[PDB]
Design a protein around this ligand. Structure first.
Ligand SMILES: [Zn+2]
Ligand SMILES: [Zn+2]
Ligand SMILES: [Zn+2]
Ligand SMILES: [Zn+2]
Ligand SMILES: [Zn+2]
Lengths: 346, 346
């Protein structure tokens, strides 16, 4: 079987190895139909970090069950499934309350482990989610990134009838916009520094857009005045300025979902911190994309949205193709400012 | 009649005046029986603080109705009342939704207008709260500071069955410990730099205490391992070190209630910020102490807790006395802060 696997930075192109076999009673073998390249998995791509180089990443994929272990009785060869990349222990106190993302002894396909840039992969039954037969199988690669946004909505007890504001017009943010619209948000606002990404956001249903390199927070809040109640704000950009921005624009009692991780420190003036208290904001930390019963309602919702064709994925796709046309992957538009998702389609 | 008048630069003085008359149909005149000094006034005395000078502070008092205006139906001379010092406009969109503390055109007794360090005061009907006639009237001066902690509990949807952690053992925090014990927290933990204040906290029912000048956040989080679920953390100290501390010790999905205002900027590492997300904390900004119906459930609860005598106020009282043992007692703060509450009794 062919594959796409890397090591200490700078190398790739395509490899060739033996098909994995089921080695445990609760494993399945998946024949991969679609597997996508994410920004999380990125800067191990050459930004290093020990880890064992060895082996490669890839946690956003779908395909069909090829074989199941002697202990698997709820899945058969040919069943459509998507990857559920996290593997919690399922038995610790955090796991028993459905806090899978707070499990101390986690595991992760395409990170801790390895994931799916190959024709086949063997994983635990718990790491696959059965898909509707009516779901286009290649859109299964988007379920995991869709659930990132849905899990924030879930933590905020839903986006329905709320004035949703998405900060950051990356793939996750763009999917959140489409989901918010599909899920009955009163309104959807997108904020980003790129006018092209905002144009994309508007085509996805964001009724208005703010360019944060052109508008100040006061100007934004002024325009938001009609929509200042029942806000649900998603910070997806993961930069200090946009966390600060979210607090400054926020209406009375807004919910503020933090989905983006920071890599720089956050400096809040006394004034800005004071606004958290004065507006009585609720700031909600969001981590990964799971809830109980495992893997969570987010996965059902994403699945449902994708089968009933509520989402537009083509504009989020920078590339489709088989191994040869994906061994491609890496070229040199540099390592990022990514157009969009890059798909492997065996 | 006498009063306590604050001028600029720490100047405190006792003055003579004429008894105030009712000048509007919706006003009442209160015969003041007990009136206390708040920590937020301390900046308005020794560090500029107040929005005008000279000023009579004092938003923490109780008394008896002396007279009512022609438009007051539901109060009569002789009724015990506590001061409700905020006056929202009651007509703006925020106010209509119960967001009184987000009213933009607020009045405030002992801040925007002169307060109750005085023998009599005239205020709007809306600025008094009828007290049970079998509440000790002097304890009325504690209702407003009790409602601060109760408002934070309210924003977190209750402290019942939760492991609450009070950070900061000042008067606000000490009352919050007692309320949590009275309201049925699963456990109460207190955190402060003073071993004596923590001993005081323990005597109020905090069944364990952490001295943050001796224990690090990891040491505390380790002791808290058994109580790590369903935490409700109140930050009352209003310094950046304790906001950072609250995030570092917090268990999975803890609620963090921000009560203390910062007067320093807040600089948080990416790592501390990451923990908000990774732990999926919920951070709740708390402002003032009101809710609907005006002035809110908090006031009704503070009042019940006092009439039921569930709270212990004497170890909170640093000073009683008339207008100039009071004046000089305030003067003796100057340098630092309060050992405990200072009260004026006629
Ligand atoms: Zn990811
Ligand atoms: Zn676990
Ligand atoms: Zn800084
Ligand atoms: Zn106060
Ligand atoms: Zn108002």
């Amino acid at each position: 079987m062919k594959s796409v696997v890397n090591d200490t930075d700078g190398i790739v192109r395509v490899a060739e190895s033996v098909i994995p076999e089921i080695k445990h009673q609760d494993e399945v073998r998946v024949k991969i139909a679609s597997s996508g390249l994410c920004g999380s998995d990125l800067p191990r791509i050459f930004k290093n970090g020990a880890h064992y180089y060895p082996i490669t990443l890839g946690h956003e994929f779908s395909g069909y069950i090829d074989a199941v272990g002697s202990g698997v009785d709820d899945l058969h060869p040919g069943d459509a499934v998507a990857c559920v990349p996290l593997l919690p222990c399922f038995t610790c106190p955090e796991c028993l309350k459905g806090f899978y993302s707070q499990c101390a002894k986690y595991d992760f396909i395409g990170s801790r482990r390895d994931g799916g840039f190959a024709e086949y992969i063997v994983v635990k039954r718990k790491n696959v989610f059965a898909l509707p037969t009516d779901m286009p199988i290649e859109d299964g690669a988007f379920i995991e990134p869709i659930t990132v946004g849905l899990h924030a909505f879930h933590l905020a007890q839903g986006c329905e009838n709320k004035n949703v504001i998405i900060i950051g017009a990356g793939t996750i943010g763009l999917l959140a916009i489409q989901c918010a619209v599909a899920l009955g948000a009163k309104s959807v606002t997108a904020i980003d520094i790129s006018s092209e990404k905002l144009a994309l956001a508007k085509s996805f249903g964001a009724m208005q857009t703010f360019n944060s390199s052109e508008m100040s927070a006061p100007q934004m809040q002024s325009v938001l005045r009609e929509l200042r109640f029942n806000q649900l704000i998603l910070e997806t950009a993961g930069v200090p300025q946009t966390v600060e921005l979210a607090v400054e624009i926020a209406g009375p009692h807004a919910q503020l979902a933090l989905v983006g991780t920071l890599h720089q420190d956050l400096h809040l003036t006394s004034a800005t911190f004071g606004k958290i208290l004065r507006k009585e904001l609720t700031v909600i930390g969001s981590w990964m994309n799971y809830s109980s019963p495992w893997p969570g309602q987010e996965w059902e919702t994403a699945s449902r949205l994708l089968t009933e064709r509520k989402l537009s994925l083509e504009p989020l796709i920078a590339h489709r193709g088989s191994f040869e046309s994906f061994a491609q992957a890496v070229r040199d538009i540099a390592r990022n400012a990514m157009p969009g998702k890059v798909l492997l389609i065996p």
